[PDB]
Design a protein around this ligand. Structure first.
Ligand code: OKS
Ligand code: OKS
Ligand code: K
Ligand code: K
Ligand code: K
Ligand code: K
Ligand code: MG
Ligand code: MG
Ligand code: MG
Ligand code: ZN
Ligand code: ZN
Lengths: 346, 346
């Protein structure tokens, strides 16, 4: 079995929120630290390859994707929330509704809503540090691949694919896959494809490159008429201006199994083949799993071996960034199965 | 000692939600049924005038302001929420963030967020019926004034001035003041002015009439840089198209007393004079009170007598619709002081 290096930051545990708005209640959050620990434990148990801590790259590569005002806001948000007297975790209460101005207010609640697309992504102490570390995990994995490695697994937490240039939500703060893709471009890779196999639409990634043709964005995901993010991810979203035909959404209905889902994967793979990129970033969620608690696809653990194998056949230098996946007792087997299938395990 | 009739619906108590999102916690809601009961008890106690229940006007006059799809959503929201397995009250978890499509999704969570500007306005059983009655309360007070009375007090609960044609929030669902103003227009009153003295900007009222010169909208409110609604209410918002110069926002900072606020009141009365309307709707909030728990002005109970005095001097047929005010100890004295001052109390 071939080897793959994994990049992991123990600082992920700095993000350990206690509350998630879900169905009118404050529930125990899905995107929990045990996700990353269960994966890493499987990486060591399977001897997948070397495990590295990330390098500190600073905010430069982050700000090639995200606005300076947004990066500023994430650094100060918690301290301003506590200094303003709020007693819970930092959660938006109101936002720019349809018909209101996209105008940045002074107030911390106002800015919370300005910079978000959802209320289920609580911020608290350590969120800044952990989101910073997750971006560096992606960037170190990009560095590994750019310096000779065929592939590298960025064991990111928190995930990234829902974050726009200046919008957080869906458990994501910095868009690690977009940051990795932009890092390839800044280093002289002319074309980069970002393939999102997470159950949910990679709406942040779509928006970040939506008017560009140097970065092909493809997502397979549940129908947004039915699931989050609801307001992007439809198949008619093919790109704007110069980006026209450089975005591809493939949507599936509830109960979709691998025998169907992989037909979309094949169409994604053909789209990538004709684009002929110099690098590949795979935003990898395993919330396509048949027992995933918030998702409605029917992939089995063994199907992730087949997903890994199909991605290797693209023949591309490949960065995997960890996104979703919330059935914790299976998440290690599922995620590492993709890496192991990539390395030739069947 | 002149008299003024009050329209009151016992159906308001059908809205009695248990939770409000606030500072990251689900707290006891501020817009509570005892607001309406405390005002009503003070109406009786001061013998202000005859009290009557509203008439049923149907959805016709409501849809002169609100879109049919929005009205349908409010009727079915709670049934769909419960049938979908949610255990809390109906609260939006995600919305159309900046960079997403204003596209109506099939999913109820999606639609909740599409139709809202905030998450502090829970929907539960009875909300539909209470919102219907509140609008009938305002339409009944409008009927009393159009049939020959100088003024009438619509004891509306829930309030309305934050609701757009198809957005709810700020504790509001149907814009009662806008509905009354439109009823005035539909009955041959050439021009109508809506004056918002609630602590918060009447963003929904502004939006509904923003491109019109036949309905003048004025609001006095706390700086939206600092307080809700945050994304409308700035003084540079003066109307668009045919509505240009027919919207007026007057903002004040924290700690503003009546001596300063009444200077803004005078600028508003002068704007009303030069508009020369055939009718006046006053969106009356007494969250301008020095003891209001969520607001930062410093009006005294006696100041409301003076505000009612000043409004009567405008010499107009006048409908008062009840908006906000959350110090329940003083809410009856404050709101009824406005009507009594209108009738000549000092
Ligand atoms: N409490 C709200 C739950 C909604 C699901 C958010 C989607 C997160 C995700 O898994 N993105 O890949
Ligand atoms: N919990 C504070 C949420 C901000 C909304 C204020 C709406 C209250 C009001 O009275 N508007 O007139
Ligand atoms: K996806
Ligand atoms: K693109
Ligand atoms: K106001
Ligand atoms: K207007
Ligand atoms: Mg605030
Ligand atoms: Mg399981
Ligand atoms: Mg849903
Ligand atoms: Zn996902
Ligand atoms: Zn108010």
């Amino acid at each position: 079995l071939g080897s793959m290096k994994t990049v992991f930051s123990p600082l992920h545990s700095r993000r350990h929120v206690k509350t998630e708005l879900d169905g009118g209640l404050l529930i125990e959050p899905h995107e929990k630290p045990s996700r990353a620990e269960t994966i890493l434990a499987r990486v060591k148990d399977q001897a997948l390859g070397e495990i590295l801590e990330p390098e500190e790259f600073g905010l430069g590569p982050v700000k090639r994707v995200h606005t300076a005002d947004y990066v500023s806001f994430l650094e100060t948000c918690w301290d301003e929330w506590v200094a303003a007297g709020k007693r819970g975790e930092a959660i938006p209460t109101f936002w720019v509704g349809r018909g209101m101005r996209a105008r940045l207010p002074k107030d911390i609640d106002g800015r919370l809503g300005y910079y978000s697309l959802g209320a289920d992504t609580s911020i608290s102490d350590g969120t800044w540090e952990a989101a910073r570390a997750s971006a560096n995990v992606a960037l170190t994995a990009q560095k590994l691949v750019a310096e000779g490695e065929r592939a590298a697994f960025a064991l990111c937490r928190p995930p990234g694919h829902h974050a726009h240039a200046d919008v957080f939500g869906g458990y994501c703060f910095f868009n690690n896959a977009a940051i990795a893709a932009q890092a390839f471009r800044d280093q002289g890779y002319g074309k980069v494809a970002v393939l999102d196999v997470d159950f949910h639409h990679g709406n942040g990634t779509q928006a970040i490159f939506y008017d560009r043709s140097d970065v092909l964005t493809i997502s397979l995901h549940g129908d947004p008429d039915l699931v989050f993010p609801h307001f992007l991810g439809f198949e008619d979203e093919t790109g704007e201006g110069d980006g026209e035909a450089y975005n591809l959404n493939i949507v599936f209905p509830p109960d979709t199994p691998f025998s169907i889902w992989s037909q979309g994967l094949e169409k994604a793979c053909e789209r990538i083949r004709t684009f002929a990129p110099d690098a590949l970033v795979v935003a990898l969620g395993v919330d396509t799993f048949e027992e995933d608690p918030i998702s409605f696809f029917k992939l089995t653990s063994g199907d992730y071996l087949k997903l890994g194998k199909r991605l290797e056949q693209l023949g591309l230098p490949t960065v995997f960034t960890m996104e979703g996946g919330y059935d914790v007792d299976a998440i290690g087997v599922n995620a590492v199965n993709v890496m192991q299938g990539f390395e030739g395990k069947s």
